[PDB]
Amino acid sequence: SRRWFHPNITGVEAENLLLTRGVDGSFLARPSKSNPGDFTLSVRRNGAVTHIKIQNTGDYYDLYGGEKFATLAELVQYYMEHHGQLKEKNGDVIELKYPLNCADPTSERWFHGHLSGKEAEKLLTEKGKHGSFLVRESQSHPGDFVLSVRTGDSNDGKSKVTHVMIRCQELKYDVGGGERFDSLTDLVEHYKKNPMVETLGTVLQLKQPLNTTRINAAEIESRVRELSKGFWEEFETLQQQECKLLYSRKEGQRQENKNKNRYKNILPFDHTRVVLHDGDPNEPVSDYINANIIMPEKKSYIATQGCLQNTVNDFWRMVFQENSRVIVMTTKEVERGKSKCVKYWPDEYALKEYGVMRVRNVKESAAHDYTLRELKLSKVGQGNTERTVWQYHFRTWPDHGVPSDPGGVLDFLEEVHHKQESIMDAGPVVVHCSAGIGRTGTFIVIDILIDIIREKGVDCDIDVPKTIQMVRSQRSGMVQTEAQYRFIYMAVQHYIETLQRR
Ligand SMILES: CS(=O)(=O)Nc1cccc2cc[nH]c12
């Protein structure tokens, strides 16, 4: 669970909560209400509260005096299982022992707040299915709530909508009897596990929240208009779901693999990692690269980090093994004086050996937003293994935030798409930035969404947060920021508009 994140709390509200309701080792995280990408970890130690800044400019969560993380849940899991690791400026250990839980329901997928009983019945009738539910404000009884649930199997009376009144009495919630809950989430979780049974026997199964994010692609402009009045609230609802994605990353945690990771705690899930075969028998662990397969759930991707000097050979082994023919690089080699990805390709017209692999740079072509490099990759000693690999190097992404206009990214992805589609039996498209989660996740999700619209036209269903959750189950923290989340919507809107004009 992620109850330690409080989306609508001030610094002083956080201090008072930890002092009145917490103990030493108590903690919570919260966003800054005016600087998105800024978060604070507030921690109680020696009867006083310390506030620790976490910044995310788009690549990773950077904890002051700690490490870089793919998600706030991974950050919290790391320190709740590693004492002595989190430290202040003056060096003392700060311990995260006791999450201080938030009662606020506004980031729950099932919470609709102000909503009429007739509006909720229409939404549940049109969009809902057996077990679809929502919680809304009563309107008749102020301060109380209603849980509306659809149960059932043409509109022939085989299904129905039931309303269950939820009383709020002295900051606890109940359905008219039995247990009184600290929050609506606790109530919903209880009646999700232990469903209410009606007198005549109907089980009110809370199977899934009502789906409000699935839109018809033609109506993207109207959804964007609505979110622009929010994008922040829909993004935070998505982020609340990240506690469901704490999958194991054991291989990346092995001593033999530690120096193959750019950031020690940003690791590939075991269940989707790229496994390298045919390694040097002399190298004890030769099967590991910080990379995952992203299979939308025909075109697949590999999301990976920027090469380290000691992983360039493994990068080319992956490319060769997976039969990838297109690489997308979304960083300059150096940004803000820091190395983001080593040069892993030869100079134009040059030939270099990278371990058992040989690469020729045949030709480079510069466009305004990117450079294309036509590379020839083969195994040393085996001439007939040569294949062309087209590297698309996006060069104009800003150092922080996102492009102001998506036209450049969309023209780049169209060209990448056409190259991939032109090559018979090409493997997954490799996409990498620096950590391989923020820009990489953004480019991949845009590509996935646009691909739907390319095959099905302007009239098909898309669901941005559900697509992002699905990509996040295959590599940690894919899509890092609210700014990238907004950019994904803007890119898809711009794509639909250029398709209508044509
Ligand atoms: C409100 S919703 O349930 O319609 N949309 C939605 C929001 C956030 C995360 C996910 C994952 C699947 N759907 C999501």
Is residue 229 helix, strand or coil?
A: coil
Question: What resolution (Å)?
Answer: 1.9
Q: What's the 299 CA to ligand 1 centre distance in angstroms?
A: 24
The superfamily CATH assigns to domain 111-209 is SH2 domain (3.30.505.10)
**Residue ranges matching CATH 3.30.505.10 in the chain:** 11-99, 111-209
Task: Tell me if 480 is assigned to a ligand binding site.
Answer: yes
Strand partners, 382: 379
Nearest C-alpha neighbor of 440 from the set 276, 330, 296:
330
Dihedral of CA atoms 27, 28, 29, 31 in degrees, nearest 10, equals -130
User: How far is the C-alpha of 476 from the C-alpha of 266, rounded, in Å?
Assistant: 8
Q: Give residue 205's identity as a one-letter amino acid code.
A: Q
The three-state DSSP-derived secondary structure of 40-86 is EEEEEECCEEEEEEEECCCCCEEECCCCEECCHHHHHHHHHCCCCCC
- Where does the chain hold its CATH 3.90.190.10 domain(s)? 217-501
Experimental method: X-ray
The closest residue, in CA terms, to atom 9 on ligand 1 is 238
C-alpha span between 31 and 182 (Å, rounded): 23
How many angstroms separate the CA atoms of 396 and 371, rounded? 10
Output the CA 239–ligand 1 centroid distance in Å. 10
C-beta 211 within 6 A of ligand 1: yes
Cα separation values, 371 from 49, 334, 368, 471, Å: 50, 16, 8, 27
Contact 438, 480 (CB under 8 A): yes
Which of 168, 307, 433, 460 is the catalytic position?
Answer: 433
- Residue 209 Cβ inside 6 Å of ligand 1? The answer reads yes
List the structure tokens of 226.
């609505």
Q: Which CATH class is domain 217-501?
A: alpha beta
92 is in an annotated binding site: no
Maximum alpha-carbon separation in the chain:
79
476 labeled binding residue = no
- CA-nearest residue for atom 14, ligand 1, is 466
Amino acid sitting at position 374: E
Bridge-partner residues for 68, per DSSP? 62
357: helix, strand or coil: strand
- CB distance 106 to ligand 1 below 6 Å: no
Ligand 1 in contact with 238 (CB < 6 A)?
yes
CA–CA distance from 8 to each of 36, 42, 102, 193 (Å)? 13, 14, 10, 28
Q: Does the annotation count 433 as an active-site position?
A: yes
Which mutation among 110, 240, 466, 468 tests ligand 1's pocket best, with the greatest number of atoms within 8 A of CB? 466
Cα dihedral across residues 210, 216, 217, 223: positive or negative: negative
- Which CATH fold topology does 11-99 show? SHC Adaptor Protein (3.30.505)
Helix H or strand E segment including 338? strand 338-339
Compute, in degrees rounded to 10, the torsion defined by CA atoms 264, 270, 271, 275: 100
Instruction: Give residue 112 CA to ligand 1 midpoint distance, Å.
Output: 12
Q: Is 436 annotated as a binding residue?
A: yes
CA 2 to chain centre: 15
Q: Is 109 in the pocket of ligand 1 (CB under 6 A)?
A: yes
**d(Cα 228, Cα 224) in Å, to the nearest integer?**
6
Terminal C-alpha separation, the chain: 47
